[PDB]
From a paper:
LEA was engineered to represent the evolutionary node that acquired the unique ability to photoconvert from the ancestral green fluorescent protein (ALL-GFP), which was engineered on the basis of ancestral gene reconstruction from the great star coral Montastraea cavernosa. Perhaps the most important mutation to make LEA photoconvertible is modifying the chromophore to a His-Tyr-Gly (HYG) chromophore, making it a Kaede-type FP. Another green-to-red pcFP named the least-evolved ancestor (LEA) was also discovered to display pronounced photoswitching of both the green and red forms. Several photoconversion mechanisms have been proposed for the Kaede-like pcFPs, and most mechanisms involve a β-elimination reaction and backbone breakage to extend the conjugation between Gly64 and His62 that forms the red chromophore, although the complete photocycle remains largely unanswered.
A notable reverse single-site mutant (LEA-A69T) involves modifying Ala69 back to Thr69, which ALL-GFP and ALL-Q62H both possess. The A69T mutation has been documented to cause large pK a changes, which is clearly the case for LEA-A69T (pK a = 8.4) versus LEA (pK a = 6.3). Interestingly, LEA-A69T is not photoswitchable under 505 nm illumination (blue), which is considered to be a marker for a primed-convertible FP. LEA-A69T crystallized in space group P212121 with a full tetramer in the asymmetric unit, while LEA-H62X crystallized in I222 with a single protomer per asymmetric unit; both crystal forms were described previously for LEA. In contrast, with a slightly twisted P-ring conformation, LEA-A69T displays the lowest FQY of 0.73 upon 490 nm excitation. The lack of photoswitching in LEA-A69T is likely influenced by the π-stacked His193 that helps to maintain bright fluorescence of the anionic green chromophore. In LEA-A69T, His193 is slightly shifted horizontally resulting in a larger angle between the two rings yet maintaining a closer ring-to-ring distance of 3.7 Å. In particular, Thr69 causes Arg66 to reorient and H-bond to the bulkier Thr69 in LEA-A69T and ALL-Q62H, instead of the I-ring C=O group in LEA and LEA-H62X via the reoriented Arg66 without an H-bond to the smaller Ala69. In contrast, the distances within the internal charge network change drastically in LEA-A69T due to the Thr69-induced changes, wherein the distances between Glu144 and Arg66 increases from 4.4 to 6.2 Å (due to the reoriented Arg66) and the distance between Glu211 and His193 increases from 2.6–2.7 Å to 3.3 Å, while the Arg66 to Glu211 distance shrinks from 4.4–4.6 Å to 2.8 Å. Such a shortened distance between Arg66 and the catalytic base Glu211 (highly conserved among LEA FPs) and the resultant disruption to the internal charge network may underlie the significantly hindered photoconversion of LEA-A69T; however, more rationales need to be developed for the further reduction of photoconversion efficiency in LEA-H62X.
Residue numbers in the entry:
A (entry chain A): 4 to 63, 65 to 221
B (entry chain B), D (entry chain D): 4 to 63, 65 to 222
C (entry chain C): 4 to 63, 65 to 220
């Protein structure tokens, strides 16, 4: 209700991947009730990035999810006070990332204070060799664990040359105040880089997300 | 084509869980094109089972999946020759199961030769203390690796008291002949014990499964 | 003690790997207090095995461990009644094996009833392509968890052509009767195939194992 | 050779655990050829830390390892140019840390630029409730992986109540210049908090580490 049909987004990511430091800023907008957002992202420090940009994109806000009425919306309920999230990204070849986002709201704009760290990517792996094409669509499994909303995802990057590179996500979402906790449910996702320049200094990103209860009997 | 709108199922599972031996036999029926099936299961050896019956139920055939026309159906294409599958179940508390099913077709009936082995369940955990209620519905991520089909699933058992117990599935599906391989896709599942006696010596089991391509950009 | 300086071993393993059924029988001897044992293994069903024999060898008894007096010996204390163990083997490429051994003692001979099952080995990986040379030596981390003794190991197979192939072991060891529980400790291992014929239908296997408390 | 019998250590860690930001500074000394070191650590920002100090201590340099003549010493050979390492810590309850250290040498002093980040610790788990007593001793398995020297460790925190809380370490070690790589080998460790104040704002830390070849063949 402080959550309007149209909202703005501003973000700052600082991070390190296999020792390479960088800073990326973003500005965009979205439709919280349609579960859509688009952002323009600019590398401010650390160009040219030496790793696959796709590892960053799901870190660049579950407010942008179409929740049906019968599933409590943890994220929209969190505002105006907001929420933070932490995530582990466990890639099948030993690469591990940690990420976090503290999300605040000022007027019609979400502010996103992000940290991203990646370690142990193999040097001839698809991330350091920039072999990724896109994330496949996914279904996130949302459940409450010790009062903490948790999402687990089987994620996969499609590779140049045709196979997949798997990553397991675990995100913990924490509202700053008391909200109605949902029961077990799902969030479907599609995320796409709509356009980019050669070194990904400039990227236009899109996400669509929809919450649901899964297949009925 | 040898796959009809209505088909029968016969099954035999032999296995162990934390060293406890058992044999379970099943007979049922299903609708391959509607992605539904029902089975009656009877414990033949090992009763009363000293572990949560729910760990077995997803081992009790992706033929019973509604596949849309634009996704190649790995499972239906494999018949009459058939297919086998192997699975690991990695529970969050260190319990690990291995399972396999070799699936043959005689006339209108699928035959299922199953092995199941579970190790390292904590003695006070929800499996050995029978504290599970059901599997939540799930979405399996299907993709080709090394010329065969892999499915990964984030599975969760609902527990007595309201929490969840997580398990990660990885299944390899292997056709006994060459089929049109599908691109990355999804299978949604719902599996339910419709009825059971107190010790789960007799169980009526139901599954619904539908394949799809996930959320579009639109 | 019923545990003598020299003891005999008989074993039967039944299992499946990638759907391939097999049975292997063994007979051997060892020195429980020296932490050594040797076994002759014969494939009885399922020859020739289509997978790396090395995945089986650590399934073919922690009785054969030199324990220093300051660490309770869970395994020797388990006899005469015996113990069982269960194991998961999580290979880095998704291959998973479950294994169990029910160990009894009749006179001077351990009997070993073994089940082994392996799934999800990639068809061109080192197990299905028989590209393994040996297990590296290891250190197992032993700790009591649910009143039950647990061992975790970072294992590695040396490969033909030079690399390693990693496997994580978790074993639970369960005495039939109450035994003194040890504090956290370590068991060092070395396992070797001493000799084998072309398709590993006949294998002579050796293990040395020594318990310790780690670096002071 | 630029590596002397007595060396000094200076470090700065910046990090976040559970969203809580902190900075810790360290000064110490050690005996690289004996595999020992001691450090004084002071929280500069973020006092009091709301999590178990023990999760930090192994991030506060394998130069401080007694290497026998028959195993190439990747770490001492990497100087004067130096080396970096990266680590993942996978705890058994889903807590995950990433850490890195860029190690330089100026005169007789190693300088350590450290980042540490921890996520998904359960609020009532032993790290957020500060229920850890110490790390157990450990044996690290060291091996080359596609040219990267890698260490894997089964680590365990002893807990209030007498159980253990397991963590799996994977560390990648990268020399700034080409160095002779070792064969598969082991490093034994013991790490101890010698003393601390009530909120661990001030900590004295000790490590002992010794490389070896494991049990001989034959």
């Amino acid at each position: 209700s402080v959550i309007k049909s149209d909202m703005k987004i501003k973000l700052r990511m600082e991070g390190t991947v296999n020792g390479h430091k960088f800073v990326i800023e973003g500005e965009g907008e979205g439709k919280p009730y349609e579960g859509t957002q688009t952002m323009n992202l600019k590398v401010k420090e650390g160009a040219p990035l030496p790793f696959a940009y796709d590892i960053l994109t799901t870190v660049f806000n579950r407010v942008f999810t179409k929740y049906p009425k019968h599933i409590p919306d943890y994220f929209k309920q969190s505002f105006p006070e907001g929420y933070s999230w932490e995530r582990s990204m466990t890639f099948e070849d030993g690469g591990i990332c940690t990420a976090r986002n503290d999300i605040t709201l000022e007027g019609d704009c979400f502010f996103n204070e992000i940290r991203f760290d990646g370690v142990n990517f193999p040097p001839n792996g698809p991330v350091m060799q920039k072999k990724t094409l896109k994330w496949e669509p996914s279904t996130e499994k949302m459940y409450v664990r010790d009062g903490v909303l948790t999402g687990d995802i089987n994620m996969a990057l499609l590779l140049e040359g045709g196979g997949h590179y798997r990553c397991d996500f675990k995100t913990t979402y924490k509202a700053k105040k008391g909200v109605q906790l949902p029961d077990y449910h799902f969030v479907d996702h599609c995320i796409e880089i709509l356009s980019h320049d050669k070194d990904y200094n400039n990227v236009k990103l899109y996400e669509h997300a929809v919450a649901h209860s899964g297949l009925p009997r």
